[PDB]
């Protein structure tokens, strides 16, 4: 399914429950409209890819984690693995997520 991150504490514990499988992260903005209209797409992979762990961070409620990756352009997606960043990209291209998932699959 998905998991909303409140800060970095939950972020680390989240990668712990992931184990070693892939772990994508959605950095969007709730106060924003357009950046929020793309959430039904990312959260869609949750049920379409039960073999992937999808997280949901808010640069407003979890601005502490956003400063870590220094996200200055939402929406943005990051690919984590074993707690190690292996790929990432920014752009309102939710469709690209498909070709991207087949990148580190």
Curated annotation (Swiss-Prot):
Modified-residue entries (S-nitrosocysteine), positions: 62, 69, 73
SUPFAM superfamilies named among the record's database cross-references: Thioredoxin-like (SSF52833)
Domain Thioredoxin residues, every copy: 2-105
Protein name: Thioredoxin
Disulfide bonds: 32-35
Effect of substituting residue 72 to A: Strongly reduced interaction with CASP3
Chief place of localization: nucleus
Active-site residue list: 32, 35
Residues bearing PTM N6-succinyllysine: 8, 94
Record PTM N6-acetyllysine, positions in chain: 3, 39, 94
Gene induction: Up-regulated by ionizing radiation.
UniProtKB keywords: Acetylation, Activator, Allergen, Cytoplasm, Disulfide bond, Electron transport, Nucleus, Redox-active center, S-nitrosylation, Secreted, Transcription, Transcription regulation, Transport, Ubl conjugation
Subunit description: Homodimer; disulfide-linked. Interacts with TXNIP through the redox-active site. Interacts with MAP3K5 and CASP3. In case of infection, interacts with S.typhimurium protein slrP. Interacts with APEX1; the interaction stimulates the FOS/JUN AP-1 DNA-binding activity in a redox-dependent manner.
This protein's encoding gene: TXN
Compartments, record wording: Nucleus; Cytoplasm; Secreted
One Gene Ontology molecular-function label: protein-disulfide reductase [NAD(P)H] activity
GO BP of this protein: cell redox homeostasis; cellular detoxification of hydrogen peroxide; negative regulation of protein export from nucleus; negative regulation of transcription by RNA polymerase II; positive regulation of DNA binding; positive regulation of peptidyl-cysteine S-nitrosylation; positive regulation of phosphatidylinositol 3-kinase/protein kinase B signal transduction; response to nitric oxide
Similarity comment: family membership: Belongs to the thioredoxin family.
């Amino acid at each position: 399914m998905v998991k909303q991150i409140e800060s970095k504490t939950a972020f680390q514990e989240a990668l712990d429950a992931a184990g070693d499988k892939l772990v994508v992260v959605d950095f969007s903005a709730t106060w924003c409209g357009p950046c929020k209209m793309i959430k039904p797409f990312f959260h869609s992979l949750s049920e379409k890819y039960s073999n992937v762990i999808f997280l949901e961070v808010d640069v407003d409620d979890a601005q502490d984690v956003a400063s870590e990756a220094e996200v200055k352009a939402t929406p943005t997606f990051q690919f984590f693995k074993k707690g190690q960043k292996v790929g990432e990209f920014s752009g309102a291209n939710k469709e690209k997520l498909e070709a991207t998932i087949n990148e580190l699959v």
